[PDB]
């Protein structure tokens, strides 16, 4: 297939969505709230990665 997930040494990551979700927001944790953003980013990073990551 196209094999969108393209592992390379330049594999910083080039999906627009999961790229913007590569944010951490693990700082100012306030474990209930911003670590929930850590959870959200892990979810929305794995979901595209499992679907498709690098079309660029």
């Amino acid at each position: 297939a196209k094999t969108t997930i393209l592992e390379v040494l330049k594999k910083e990551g080039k999906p627009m969505s999961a790229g913007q979700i590569a944010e951490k927001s693990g700082l100012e944790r306030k474990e209930v709230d911003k670590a929930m953003k850590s959870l959200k980013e892990e979810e929305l990073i794995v979901s595209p990665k499992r679907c498709y990551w690098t079309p660029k």
């Binding site: 297939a1 196209k2 094999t3 393209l6």
Partner: protein, 358 residues
């Protein structure tokens, strides 16, 4: 870097059913070799057993392709049957359409394929007779209604040329192998005999004049020609007890090529010997004819083959060994298989022998 990402899948059926779901996607960043681009095409091949008593299968092929800025379409629909073990008979119709032009045709051609040696000393000694030298004659009677003016003009031109040019029979050869075909032909071991035009006739039909042409030619194969050596293996009309489908296509631009293929058809599995089955011997004409395009860019393959055996079947041999096994699905990924993919994509005819048995 010119990567080539491919994924192939072969789901099989148990027993003696040679039926297979063949799926295949591919994406190559190398430019295609078509002097006109972009080139897009979709090809459908649906065959159904029409009259099994006489061995007739109705096979319909639809090609729809955009080249540069022109749309082209070639539809055909023919009942084909095995008149004998060496002769095959086809009665069919079809049409071509290119932009602001189109014409239908009806044909009643017959194909007689016969080898040059049927010795039993070879059949009992070589269990895998890849090369089989032979000659395949075609006696083609085709009728075209000359509804359009250009059809009539070309009919008149052909009538003038055949009746005046003493070297039409051989120059037609390099006519109807347009461009690189006449090269690839010779690169596949295929020879073409000087045609004989048994007759041109303006036998008018019920709705206008009809150009009827009967001509006989013959193409000879040095064994690398699958249309000759694998003759009986090309036509699993015996195996066809239900409709068989193929839906392929490719989209090509200067950026690269994409290929899709999804089919359900027999002839995928053949008996190697002693209850042992085998994914059919790879045809060599596609490989050698691909070598005329596959040797133009240096590419790195990311290929993954997925042979899903029927419930209760095991692979007893794989020349490039399988990468992984999921108790019915055998996966080839990287390693020697990647080398073999790079080998065949560039025109190689190496053996990929998958032997499997219950």
């Amino acid at each position: 870097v010119t990567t080539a990402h491919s994924d192939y899948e072969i789901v099989l059926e148990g027993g003696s059913s040679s039926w297979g779901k063949v799926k295949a996607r591919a994406k190559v960043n190398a430019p295609p070799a078509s002097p006109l681009l972009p080139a897009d095409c979709d090809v459908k091949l649906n065959v159904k057993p029409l009259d099994p008593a006489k061995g007739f299968v109705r096979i319909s092929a639809v090609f729809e392709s955009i080249v540069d800025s022109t749309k082209n379409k070639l539809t055909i629909e023919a009942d084909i049957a095995n008149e004998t073990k060496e002769r095959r008979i086809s009665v069919g119709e079809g049409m071509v359409s290119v932009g602001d032009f189109s014409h239908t045709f009806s044909f009643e051609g017959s194909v007689v394929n016969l080898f040059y040696y049927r010795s039993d000393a070879v059949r009992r000694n070589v269990p895998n007779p890849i090369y089989m030298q032979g000659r395949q004659f075609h006696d083609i009677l085709m009728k075209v209604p000359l509804d359009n003016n250009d059809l009539i003009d070309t009919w008149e031109g052909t009538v003038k040329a055949i009746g005046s040019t003493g070297a039409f029979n051989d120059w037609i050869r390099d006519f109807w192998f347009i461009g690189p075909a006449f090269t690839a032909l010779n690169e596949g071991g295929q020879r073409i005999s000087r045609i004989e035009v048994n007759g041109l006739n303006t036998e008018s039909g019920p709705k206008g004049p009809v150009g009827v042409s009967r001509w006989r030619f013959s193409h000879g194969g040095s064994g690398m020609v699958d249309s000759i050596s694998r003759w009986a293996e090309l036509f699993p009309s015996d195996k066809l007890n239900r409709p068989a489908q193929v839906e392929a296509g490719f989209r090509s631009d200067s950026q690269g090529i994409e290929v899709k293929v999804d089919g359900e058809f027999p002839g995928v599995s053949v008996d190697a010997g002693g209850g042992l089955r085998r994914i059919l011997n790879h045809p060599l004409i596609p490989l050698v004819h691909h070598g005329m395009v596959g040797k133009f860019n240096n590419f790195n393959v990311d290929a993954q083959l997925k042979v899903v055996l029927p419930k209760g079947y095991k692979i007893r041999y794989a020349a490039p060994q399988y990468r992984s096994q999921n108790l019915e699905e055998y996966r080839w990924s990287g390693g020697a298989y990647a080398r073999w993919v790079e080998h065949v994509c560039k025109g190689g005819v190496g053996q990929f022998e998958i032997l499997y048995a219950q």
